[model samples]
Target: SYNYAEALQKAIYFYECQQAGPLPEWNRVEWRGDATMNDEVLGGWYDAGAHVKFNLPMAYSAAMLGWALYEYGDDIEASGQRLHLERNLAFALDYLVACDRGDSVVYQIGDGAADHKWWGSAEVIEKEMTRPYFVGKGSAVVGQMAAALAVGSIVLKNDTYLRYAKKYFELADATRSDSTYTAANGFYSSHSGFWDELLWASTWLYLATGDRNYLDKAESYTPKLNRQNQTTDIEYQWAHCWDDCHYGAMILLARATGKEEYHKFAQMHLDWWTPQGYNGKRVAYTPGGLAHLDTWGPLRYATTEAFLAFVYADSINDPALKQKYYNFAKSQIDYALGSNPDNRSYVVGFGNNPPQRPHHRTAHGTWLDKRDIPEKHRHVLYGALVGGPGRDDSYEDNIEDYVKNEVACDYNAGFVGALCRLTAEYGGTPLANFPPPEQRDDEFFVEAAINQASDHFTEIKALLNNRSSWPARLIKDLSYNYYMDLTEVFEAGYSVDDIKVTIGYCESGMDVEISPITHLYDNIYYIKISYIDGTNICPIGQEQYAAELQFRIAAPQGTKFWDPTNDFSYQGLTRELAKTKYMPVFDGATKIFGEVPGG
Candidate 1:
């Protein structure tokens, strides 16, 4: 049973670390790629196998995730992972808002040429601070943002998201006569046109708010859906993506307003996907029944279409449509899960012989860094849906095959969403659930947190020199091996839930930063105080160390801490951690003299 629950969590974690820019509480994760574009268009997932963040695909993935949660949140919640999705989704929506600034929305974060040139773990690189390319509010990117925000509005039940959705919608529809988002280099520009994206946004708004205004706007494009032989061959060309939403729109409109014609239009696309149906002839499948939609990234096509089929099936409540299309959807996913001609899972870390070498920076590690062990993947990518087999049903496990091995934020949205539904409906066997991913992605986070805690304590342990005030031999420092339940340590109350433990060296000063996020949790949060020596912070000559452990064990009597920075300065530490903003920085140091920057 390849339930992929572990993969789902790991996939989401990749976005948190690999894609995110500098955020307020999260420190250490931000490096070159992250900090370069963080100030304005700071956060979002990289578009593909590359480290570039394309707004079109980013929005598409977010919308898919939002919908998945909206449609099958109970599944996620039932599976004990709803909060994880909610936390990640909130981060994405916040980034979208930052990008869609009304005047002009950021369209892409990385300069493909410049960013790609410096390839390695973004965490390690001092990436160029390239200004993000942007677009005036118009077309699909905006529409895509609008859809995500609208769904976000519904899901979070927040008015802010609602306003943002409408705000972008007005701008996108401001000049609507079938114009696409002007193509950037070679990214989101490939979509058919902005027309379908607008409809996609409109449909979500209609669903989110039940507003007839959105309804009217969404339904306006109905007639073209089923026009006779629109594709010349008269076969089905139905599906959804960052580019088009004709099929999805039909299904949504039919489901929402209960329009018979809308259902009929949706049926047209469904027919195309279903074998022997009218338009199904245009689309071909592999020997294993995977919809071989195109020569390039066939798995992307198959997995996304599978999600669409599942959504459509869920929408109509027709047992025939449900059973028939459900089978098709599962069949496609199964094909990716090794039910194919190759007998290999297209997903990176699941089933038999998953991709050994995916085209990824974090996973493959940087060649320049001797520290990088290519043999031992730094991040064990779980549940990643890779670029799939060819139209000829050909696939190779080579990492160089970007077309075949690259994974994306968009590819897994539908697949993971389907996983939720499949798991909910058939827990015992939606095929199978292999032991959650072999490598726990959380291992890194937990280790980091332990490391952070240990390092901070060591840096500040010098404070115990004044044994009268601070006893030296009294501390049995908790390193990676020990997760200390030292909530009552030294009468300084701290616990696992919401504690801020900052150990500062004599040359330290520093929440310094409320971890906007925890490291891959490798169950605890982590911070590295990653300030590279001599670059941002300097080493100290004096012996002065102090740490503040804040605790929030329960209700009204929540979270309190003593200022260790002042205590250390008073003690013996000569220099101090520069008092910076109350946020975690890359090295956990903003101000430092000798004692410590961040303990």
Candidate 2:
């Protein structure tokens, strides 16, 4: 339930308010500098005497705004805002049409400032009107913008817009067969090529003219999607941004042309990448599912968008497909919404700062390089970390090394968007049947154990209460390190009472005796005593390693654990002896050596 007319009205206002003076060339300023002559324009800055800029996105935005206003303005007119709506819509269309390139691609940015004559003249009209401007200079950008503009034309039924749209469509059609702009696998190179532009142009052509050739071109581009698949890994289609864009465009094209192949391709991508189940039915697991994981990556947003697409698909006529995607989207939205109350202030997007580079000088040098977990892993970890109960136990390794930075805009946006959409659709608060113990079984127990440990650490922090500078100092020191430790404890269920504590420097073979304790049940555990002659293990250099001693305690004769087998060797007693030599950090080494208390 969006205020569609209101959104269009705002779009018109924003476009009208923008500076519409002469645009500059590419060589006008510093490349990386933030200062811009028209900051309102997305990239209107001078970079090191170069105009490192483009007009495609701007043109696309303008065209879409115009299209939305024209198509949806009837309601505003009925609401007695007809005059204002008409004026704004006209202005938006004028601006968009003015951005046309006649026969070439869109000019990403005006020519460089240093070479003001780069586009063939000092006069804007002279440069923009020339054959070189369209044929050689602004081909790719114009092609993309034209494609978008064509869609606008079709939606608004404007013949002039349609004519220019057709002209650009023909220009793109001439070069659609060229594969030089694409990689061996059909991936578009980062240039003004036909790779992705073909998809965009084809969609516009199909929408405007109802031409099957456009849809044909779109379907033929399916091979390019394979370029996104990874041959070296288990995953065949590790859907990236390009893949999503391609799929989104394909879905639109399929819907318009009634082509089953394009629709199937879109569904195939959703099926292959989304999380597989919702309320017990098998669905596709996507890159966004990785957001549910604790790690981070760029594709996190892709997952969010994919989930949204499922909702869009649900509005279609196919009941089975609608039920399938809607169910999964609901489950995912439920999970994300449930996580909101915990830490709403934290930003939640992809990519960590200080970048997660590993220490390359240790014995684990090769391991360090391998530690670069994929974006999917990060998303999965994020979900598990935030999702209650059994979801946390699904990860094999500890999350201690995966540091969570302060909450960011991107992360929070995804989380908030997911929750808002869920609440809007589901009509209730989330985690209605949370803790998910029934679904996860013993995995829930593991999560409970880690939560207990996390609680204990919180208590310890409160007790210290600034008794010394240790806690504050430790917080900063272990923001990356100790936080990783907490993640490990959550995943692996570490207990001091049941294991021996060993702190050894991996490269130096130096060992330290940490204070024995009964249990560590906190998200933030504190280590007060020096493991090696006043060297605080918690605040040690990043190059250090902490190894725990593992011990198992036998249960009483009749006591039962979750043993799958009934044999004595399979019981707790034999299993304890099979894996002994570990002591708890809090209970001290002496207590560990003594006989069992109730034996």
Candidate 3:
């Protein structure tokens, strides 16, 4: 059996890993730090692997978290993850409240196309370019925000959340259009329309305030909900996802109102997820017993439904229906926690043979802007739930497979609720000293090689790399020193002035400046190569991650004074490029990598 509480704890931690902007003091993730601080709205989880904050899924995620806490807070507290869940939920709720401009909200931040095109850590993205945020009055986005805040107001007992919730609810009900929600077009488009969001938000508001007016509004919006194919019933084929919440809304409405029609719709949806389908029109199940819903993020669909199934099951009095729904709920969650044919957990940093390569750019910690450079992820992503297997239960841990490997906020939203319920039933202990410190590798260093050697001169090709991931940062005044022993030059009756430093080649566009031969001490001298604007020497494209310079220290053509063997930085350098500690790098005046010559 799975340690459901640990899973619950990890699930909550996944949100922390997704956090953007200035991290809280209590943040346990060591490798994560402040990112996207320049955005109009600062804090929120970065949507999926990229740094864009798509508010539709973001608010949907927050709302789902609120719903989970509202329903299963006591249970989750028993598992020792209540504080974590609450804190994480509050972060998103606060961000949603912050999104509220006077009239419209800043719905999306960072262009989708531009954000996806780059693949480095979130901390370094701002240095590359200034990201743009989009503002709109889209009902779907606003209503989702309202639902999150409304439920948050009840769960966290904060009046401010409720105030924003009510304001946003009115905004959504009034606009009733997604035409302005244009920024998230190719990604996270409001396909399910705004009616479900209206119903979802209104129901949450009624639950928060116990107001008859909100209840009436929720009921009024139900008719506008999309219908199932050709049937008169509300759409139940699609799982409860970012695009639609009517399935969850109807379930919540059934419990809140206890109406016969509401119960019918709710049960009908749950039944369709069960093995004994609703009138034999059930969803397709894998040979391994997973309720395969759609090609994209089937685990997200199934696990989200699992939470809904558990919720709906607890609301009713029918024994057979309850057992059926509960079993379905457990089955789907178990599959995610490793019960499939592969017996591999779909969650990162979890059970037997968990996913090592989920399609996440930041967690991969790429310095070259290429996913395959590290070959393996440098940092553990912890609790992210990746996209699930194919229809026949086929799966892989490929980083490029966005279809079955991409993880997102919506993917884990409902899954958290299911974990809460499961932990309530079968207990698990949270790790006491969770998130052990990570082993850090050398990030800033130099890769050098001897380009050409002569009696009079030694030409060296060196690359100053900034492969930092101790929360990947930018170095403004980057410089590195190439040390040499001028004993042979002095012996040849030449002074430090005789040894002239000249740049043979430097990467174009780099503001590289090579210093003249400067004396370090007696018979020892070095040249410091500094980048005026080294922020451009970022961990990005091929030519960007490292600054390459081919420089020469010569003592005229006739003077046989240069000896590469005695040079401090040239001791082990070969024709092929290699990491050399002798060529020390610096972030301003401080040495970050390599060894300097004798003082």
Candidate 4:
């Protein structure tokens, strides 16, 4: 219901906020280190929680964004963040292209000597990436680098990057042959082994180039990866994290080759964690609907898994398996969009009561004496999704609460891509819930706590004029919930409230007068809307007003207003079957049940 395109934009902007190097761009982050390097090692995203660019995760981010553009550019374009994603990837690709010489690649950047010393933006500073430490081969750096370049080439349609990608991919292969591969220093270090990344890189090359050689290479690594991925271990292994690779490999392989082994390999991972599976049985399910296996970063794991599920669904031919993965992905995304126990959208500034204080130095920049900055002083880093809730699904908005509230560029990589794909495919979150089994809940509902029912604007207008006319039913109810759309109200714009009745000049092209709540039967105030000529103002149809009207009340952005309100309960306001009456609630019509200025 809200603007998901904007959310997707802001998430990518988080990378721009983490931009390093010297380029007087439109919105470069304020500087910390000001030193400029060989012009070769310039421009890319910062690693998690710090102002240093770690190629491992940075490469992963590039591959994810580029892959999204390659497969679902329309979805990315629909999300309204396509250019920023493209621009930022270009920045990384530029650096990546430079990182690769004719023979080797530089896999790390920014001076560790100065990077972790003080917490600040990377804009005003200069840093180092060590020895050009030319790591020529292996999946640790060269493998992922080749994947990044391949993805970049496909998205931008640039042969320059593709040529470079092939060189790096071939060189990476050469390393295993010559035994000349080496790992770089610092935190971006990969101890998880490099075989999976090599497979992942080859699989991606196969997708981008559609070459049989890369496919053969990808298949060569499958046996080892499948053995690890299908394990009975309880730890979540398929996470789309900086250290993981099996998930990314399987997704591309299945789609690129239509191979059953690859499809099963992909399904095996989803089945390992999705609610009814092996790890699902092992992990603790939070009341919030997340399989809260480890508190390290559950939402990241959720989004990462959701991204893969959606991508893999497209590769298979079976409708049942496709729907199963799609639903699995959708459910995980719903939890992030506020379907959880608390109903808080983990994305900052979205939904009612989003995180006011994320553990971020950029958003909390130029601190005002560091004494718990007031709400006014706390900047809202729009679109940045936080690390998210604990194993118990409990969370806080404390600025210093890094574990539960921190934000990072890489943390959003897969999630942002997945969010766009889902939103674009389905046209944003459905106004109604998915129906149980074979049915879908496309029904609309207008619900409120304090409500008023009127027969016609003439009689209500007569009352405001202190007169009378043909009377109609006026029912007052204790509650309203999951009420269906009332068709007759298209002639007027309606505003419903929850706590206080709106009392002002409130008109949205609907001929109406409002009665403000001065006193009330309940603790909350109230308002009444009456249309003078709403019944006849339209092009004029007899059935328009003859049928009962329907309206729906939606909660404020960050609050939990979504639920099973379809069945008529204490919340039912106008409960006639939609088919029994002419259709109500036009496409652009809005229902209100939250706080706002209205009357």
Candidate 5:
């Protein structure tokens, strides 16, 4: 599964596509271009023209390349490839570290002007630099580096990689305490206190070190996260800031610490309701609508997060809840597979029904009738409403745009990865009456779909396995309903592995006895009887007699014995065996009995 050759090839492609102009330090690649113009942000660096914002993409590209080599290096024969990956990764890390200004913060990027020292002025670009705080991009890149280091460490068995992961975790931890880096109640923001950045950093740090400090930081801010219902510019409405990224972090904390409150919060978010269907449900919205929605709306990122949330909930024994989100995820997959008009290679972003409006548009243009820039340039909005891809013609207005867009890896990677994951997890099997298309016929799509699914499962399983304090009791409770079916009763002699029975008699002072006492693994057995029928067995006279009857094991020898300690009662008595005491009778009685040969 580790296609070293393929990964290497892709890595080289990314490297070659790097933009060397303006800032030679940054690599433009395919996914980093004008968000509005490209319709996707796959190529070019963040704020390429600006001095301080140059290295963001460089850092990301290096880390990605490093990870690719680390993952697939075994197949590579050339040392040059390995060295290149390592060098790039190292350069990215060193660059970021050099940008650090002490007091636990890094400069947004290099100096604003060429003559000024890299650390001289903090006049970073608005979107790229913002402030020197550990906001979204900074926190995200740090996490990325840590993750890359972790993978590299494991693959190479190198302590340096491990140390890098640890160091990055520490760096991220410092922001938790810096007031300037957090909201009033401690919610992390963009550049300074973006909730997404804090959560992203916390998640990476936890994964890297399994440390309590990172977890504590994540937990401390959860309650204060914004939880409200509001409309979005997209078709769907309503969203939560914390649930966007922090919900997963909260669930992870709850699991790691064995805290009920954390789980409760997770459940609350999962079950949160609003008048809007898309907003009320987690992971609501079609991927195509992202072009018209707000970044924080209910569609784009929510769907992925919602699916992941279901995974978390299911891990905790909430299959019903899990199924709910799984169904929604399945719906998206179905739409993509069946109705998407695109080349199936890429998923489209938004659409309108006939008589409503046309579908395709550039990211910068307003949706059908609405006037607003879509959340992210690329259609695959990860945060909220309006997720998917915009029209290629509008975004890739010319040959240059198409070439620039095609070289980026993130766009293709994200789409392929997401679809692949969905297919792997819930693909193959038919839902309702529909079956998945033949895998061979759609090999490429299937491969991408399964890959994403496999990756997600791997991550989830790891998280579940590592968390120590997860409530075993809750797990047990959750297990109770897992695949449970209604108990069905059959003929008296019927045998099934899961069925059991108890018996009672009215003749002996209402004394009871269980027949075929052994636990039956298969459905079939006879209830042999040896009962004392006294002379007064039948009450002849109204003023007089009654006979005492007791029960004992009769037929089906070697049957199991019933525990006398347990409360056992009979349903009722029958007279089908009245004519002959020893005769076999499949009596239609209140109670049934059975036993298997061995079990």
Candidate 6:
């Protein structure tokens, strides 16, 4: 019912939007630019809506994308999105290779708390704070990195990726301790321990290098994997996710090595996700048919399992079981694509009534360190799978609801594969001019208010702001003009010189210069207020977002001829600051906002 090829293409684009540091020349997102370039390892996808780069999930995301291409690359080539999928996958896999520090891996970048505190476009983040990177020898982190590079080696056919994959796998295998992985404690802790990652990584390495030792190592890590309560078998209840890969590892092992033991574990996991339970046990489901695994990211969990189901069904020979698993997989993906009870898409910028307010700071494009001011997202985060509904299928398209509305790299990682599988089956067309040019809004503007008004003089409080999000950038020669009607001065037998322009006040530390009264046309006088160092007025914080100043245009001290009622900028201004198009903001000499008196 939906264009799955376009969804796959858009899902890959979501990663391009999440890219940090220097972007590739082929980057397609118009609203994104180089960000967080100063980190130890510069390029990687930000973990979620915030700028923090958690390598655990980031690596998991890369690996899942690699696995998708490895499995369905040829199948999805007809959709004309194979190159895009490969490029996006390589971006993150390359980031994993860059994280190698020999002794330890740089696992995370940017502080979670500080990054979330200031909400603004990623392009202007440097003005806010210097991001920090955390490095450690955590097997959970390294193991995932190894898995990503290993699969990337196969799909991308890059020997360099395989080299790093083997090195990282050895590092993870030798140092099984996660003691130094403390920085991501509350954010992305090793919930399922490091054994699952070791198993997952080793399995990928075996498939990549065709090394029997790697295969033997993967099997040895099985008993150490988390088990069902009061049972000796490996856990099969929980869905595959960023934190745990045992579910996916089992599936991969079942397919790679034709063993009934691995097949039994894989089948059990997929069966639990289906409508029919296995051994009278099953995962919870919504009334609308989503396999609701957890409240945090039911869509992420369900779609990931959908990818696994597709892969497992393709591996097995039973016709009935194959259809069962395939139907379950398709149902979950369809639900995300608007087969829900509400007939709404959980993915941003896709299908019917997709989410508009995903909890992503960069896409929201705020310059004031505020989320609500924009009222709507400034950029479309195309194909980002948002955290989905609750157990009862309740959802809100609110940016404040991080749990349900947040979009992440891992959220779309597995979902991309599911989309690829669907695209291969359904055959939909990819957008030829993907990411069509968007209409831009006024970024640079002037907000003014009447500070005080009298017959002799009129004092106006003005803010020259840079809320730029069309690739938020700094302006050096930024200024605005205030137009005034000087007919009263001429009537009072005084020339334009009689009208004085003086700065009443300017925010301290801001270099603001108010020009003298200058004649524009008949009976029209104006003053240009310029920021000598306008780059200081950036999107970092409240104090930096705008330059505030109060200036008074006056007649002689005792004159009663001064009138501001007819002033162009003062027409609708009140005590509170209001955006006025009459003032006409400028970057250098070109008008960027508002209008001139005659023009």
The count of backbone overlaps in candidate 3 is 0
Candidate number that wins on TM-score, 3 or 6: 3
**What Cα-based lDDT does every candidate model obtain?**
0.57, 0.33, 0.90, 0.56, 0.32, 0.89
Q: For candidate 4, lDDT tens digit of each residue in 1-599?
A: 44556556666666665565544265433322222344347776666655555677778788877877776776655455567678878877777887876766676665554555444323222211222334444456777778888989988888998988888888776675323333335555665666677787887788788889888887886654434545643223457666667677777767767777766667767776676675444345687678565666677777877888888887677897788878878787778777787878888766667787776654553212231533431245666778888877888778767677877766787877787777677554321221112211222222222232322211111111100001111111211112222222222333233212223233243454444422332222223344444322221112222212223233233433323222122132233322211111221234312222222
- Candidates 3 and 4: which is better by lDDT? 3
Lowest-sum lDDT 10-residue window in model 1: 465-474
Off by over 4 Å in 6: 483-500, 516-526, 540-543, 560-576
TM-score of each: 0.68, 0.39, 0.98, 0.64, 0.38, 0.93
| Model 5: per-residue Cα lDDT over 1-599, one tens digit each | 22222223233323322222222333322222222121111222322211223333344334334434432444343322444345434534444444434334342332334311111111111212222323332444444445445544554556766676666645654444334322112111232233443554455455556767766766665554554445321111222222134554565566667788766665665544211233335433334422212322122233343344434544576666666655544444333232344423122221222111112122112211121222222222111111233432112222122221222222222222233234333333212211112111100000000111111010000000000011000011000000101122123332334233323233433222324433223322333222222111111121112222232322123333322111111111122212111122111231112211323
Residues 500-575, candidate 6, lDDT per residue (tens digit)?
7788788987888878878788888788988888878888777888888988887888889887888887888999
All candidates in order of TM-score, best leading? 3, 6, 1, 4, 2, 5
Looking at model 5, residue 50 earns an lDDT score of: 18
State the lDDT at 207 in candidate 2. Answer: 68
Query: Tell me, what's the RMSD of every candidate?
Result: 15.2, 22.3, 1.4, 21.6, 30.8, 2.4
Q: Let me know the TM-score candidate 2 reaches against the reference structure.
A: 0.39
lDDT of 1: 0.57
10 residues in a row with least lDDT, candidate 2: 440-449
Q: Distance (Å) between predicted and true CA of 48, model 5?
A: 9.7
Task: Summarize candidate 1's per-residue lDDT along 1-599 as a digit string, tens digits.
Answer: 55555545545554554455654353113222333333456766766655676777788888888887888887665456566676667777887887766555776666666655554554333322344464555577788888889988887777888888888888887855334445454655644666677788888988887779888887675543343454432124745666676666667777787877767766777667766565335478766677877666677777777777788888777797788788878888788888887777777666788887777765554334322334554445566788887766777777667778877888777776776676566553221332233332111111111112221242222111111100001112211111222323335544344444343322344212222223333232333333123121111112211222222112113334423332212233223432212222221323212222235
TM-score of 5: 0.38
Estimate candidate 5's RMSD in Å. 30.8
Residue 371: error of model 1 in Å?
15
Q: What is the lDDT of residue 565 in candidate 2?
A: 30
Flag regions of model 4 displaced more than 4 Å.
Answer: 24-40, 111-114, 126-138, 177-186, 229-237, 279-284, 367-378, 428-599
Clashes of each: 42, 86, 0, 27, 53, 0
